[PDB]
Amino acid sequence: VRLKSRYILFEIIFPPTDTNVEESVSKADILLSHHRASPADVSIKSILQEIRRSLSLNLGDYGSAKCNSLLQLKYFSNKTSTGIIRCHREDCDLVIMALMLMSKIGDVDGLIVNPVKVSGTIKKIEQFAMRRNSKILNIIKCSQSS
Amino acid sequence: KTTVPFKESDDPSIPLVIIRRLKTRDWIVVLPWFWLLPLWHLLNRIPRMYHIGLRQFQQIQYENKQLYFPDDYPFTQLGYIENS
RNA sequence: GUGGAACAGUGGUAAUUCCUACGAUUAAGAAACCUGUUUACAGAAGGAUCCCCACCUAUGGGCGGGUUAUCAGAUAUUAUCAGGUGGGAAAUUCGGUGGAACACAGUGGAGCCUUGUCCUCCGGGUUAAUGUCGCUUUUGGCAUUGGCCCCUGCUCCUGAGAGAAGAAAUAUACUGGGGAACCAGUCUUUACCGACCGUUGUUAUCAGAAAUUCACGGAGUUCGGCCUAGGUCGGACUCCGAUGGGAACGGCAACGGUUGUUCCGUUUGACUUGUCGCCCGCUACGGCGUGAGCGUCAAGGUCUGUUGAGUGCAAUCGUAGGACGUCAUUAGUGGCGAACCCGAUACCGAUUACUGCUGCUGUUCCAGC
């Protein structure tokens, strides 16, 4: 028996909270309007400090004790706002439900978190993420060509 | 050059027969007993040629909707006796 | 001697209990993951019937032009889906195979020598010939020479695996232990004779005559010389000598004469790229453009080219229902299906960790007479 850990891919999506300005109805246009950008003060340690505080205030102490045994952020870059969280296979339910209840960062509010891909290895999650981003480039290129 | 030339006086010209077998969709080539091994050794040294087991031959007969005597022939005497 | 209970050792054997359903996508491979639905065709390739107009003949009909309805196995559906998922050891620092084609030492080359001797196992039995010595058709004993006879236990390429020791024993060859089946080491196996190979070093100190068939002391036998109441001397054999684990050519370690020794090289690849050569056209001093053509060579560019599991910061899942087994119940249900361990190319053999079954052996306790 080895370390059977599960990696979880999450993406930060910003909904277009603007009631005074009109909106355009299309597929890749709303992908552009939701996948805009990450703000300035976003790093690995900031997301970890926010998710530990959400783990404390939402799930408690002993739930945070079970979660924070192998709770690390393995890969994250602010240019694309996609991150990979390592966790146990038993508390993967707890980690995904903690990712769901992420309300706001302490600096920037008005954002939702999308958990997309869960697997027991990071190499297949990277392969699925490249194919998903390739599909995003296909939708962008189809709406850009016409 | 990598060859050995042929001489009509002192080289062992063999008879070689290659025939098609229809329902099993496979080419069978027949040859004398002690001549088979100089032919067989040079076959899979071509790097896209592998050898078959009789389980794999049963798989090939199962794939081509064909039949096999120790297993897929229960009607005959020996097949029924052996299999059952 | 028997039956029951318990324990121990060895041999053989099996391990997700099995089945069913479900687990987001036109962004068409997100339950954790993999594979599959590619040898393209509706005897629709001058397809069939049918509409109108014009032509020729008449008892049937055919040609020409134009729009163009119906039909292609369940009058249907082109855009769904299926299957599988860690095992007896994957473990253990074990070994071998996929390079050798039946020993064709897998093949080739070079160097050296004792130059690769169709040789010799020793040994034992029979037969023939010769010479000597005793009996006298002739036989017996000795030595030489020539000829014959004397054992692949089984499967397997390898590694290895297990069977039995009535040709001298009771314990089934020898030696040591085990509680007994037995274990380890040296060995042999239709042996109708047996066979523990040689060399070197070691067994420290004391003891003893001596730690390797050195030597020494005593007794017995046989032979030779001086010699003849048989005294002595030399050589050979046998036996013994208080000690120490010891005197037993016994124990330990290293090296092969086997068919001469040693060295060197591959027979192992597939795509991609680059160079060179071959046929076609232009041009003619080597040149240039295409074949989705072939052969050679090179390159840490790649190897999901990956396996009825195939990952490689290492997937092998969660739940519900039904079937079966065991154990405990207050009304009839509840709990459990374990443990070891997770490979990383595959296979086989051996060892080690645990559960259950099965046979044998040994022990203890209790009686039937």
Swiss-Prot record, chain A:
One Gene Ontology term of the biological-process aspect is: intronic box C/D snoRNA processing
> What GO cellular component entries does it have?
cytoplasm; nucleolar ribonuclease P complex; ribonuclease MRP complex
Could you cite one Gene Ontology molecular function of this protein? ribonuclease P RNA binding
Q: What class of enzyme is it?
A: hydrolase
Q: Where in the cell is it found?
A: Cytoplasm; Nucleus
Catalytic reaction list? Endonucleolytic cleavage of RNA, removing 5'-extranucleotides from tRNA precursor
Q: What is its EC number?
A: 3.1.26.5
- Keyword check for Ion transport: no
Keywords, comma-separated and alphabetical:
Cytoplasm, Hydrolase, Nucleus, rRNA processing, tRNA processing
Residue ranges crossing the lipid bilayer per the database entry: none
> Whom does it interact with, and what assembly results?
Component of nuclear RNase P and RNase MRP complexes. RNase P consists of an RNA moiety and at least 9 protein subunits including POP1, POP3, POP4, POP5, POP6, POP7, POP8, RPP1 and RPR2. RNase MRP complex consists of an RNA moiety and at least 10 protein subunits including POP1, POP3, POP4, POP5, POP6, POP7, POP8, RMP1, RPP1 and SNM1, many of which are shared with the RNase P complex.
Which family does the similarity line name? Belongs to the eukaryotic/archaeal RNase P protein component 2 family.
* Task performed by this protein: Component of ribonuclease P, a protein complex that generates mature tRNA molecules by cleaving their 5'-ends. Also a component of RNase MRP, which cleaves pre-rRNA sequences.
Other facts: Present with 2230 molecules/cell in log phase SD medium.
UniProt name for this protein: Ribonuclease P/MRP protein subunit POP5
Species this protein is from: Saccharomyces cerevisiae (strain ATCC 204508 / S288c) (Baker's yeast)
UniProtKB/Swiss-Prot annotation, chain B:
Q: Where does it localize? A: Cytoplasm; Nucleus
Q: According to the lineage, what is the superkingdom? A: Eukaryota
Q: What else is known?
A: Present with 846 molecules/cell in log phase SD medium.
Q: What does this protein do?
A: Required for processing of 5.8S rRNA (short form) at site A3 and for 5' and 3' processing of pre-tRNA.
Whom does it interact with, and what assembly results? Component of nuclear RNase P and RNase MRP complexes. RNase P consists of an RNA moiety and at least 9 protein subunits including POP1, POP3, POP4, POP5, POP6, POP7, POP8, RPP1 and RPR2. RNase MRP complex consists of an RNA moiety and at least 10 protein subunits including POP1, POP3, POP4, POP5, POP6, POP7, POP8, RMP1, RPP1 and SNM1, many of which are shared with the RNase P complex.
Q: What is this protein called?
A: Ribonucleases P/MRP protein subunit POP1
| The species this protein was found in | Saccharomyces cerevisiae (strain ATCC 204508 / S288c) (Baker's yeast)
* Gene label: POP1
* Boundaries of the shown chain within the full protein: 530 to 613 of 875
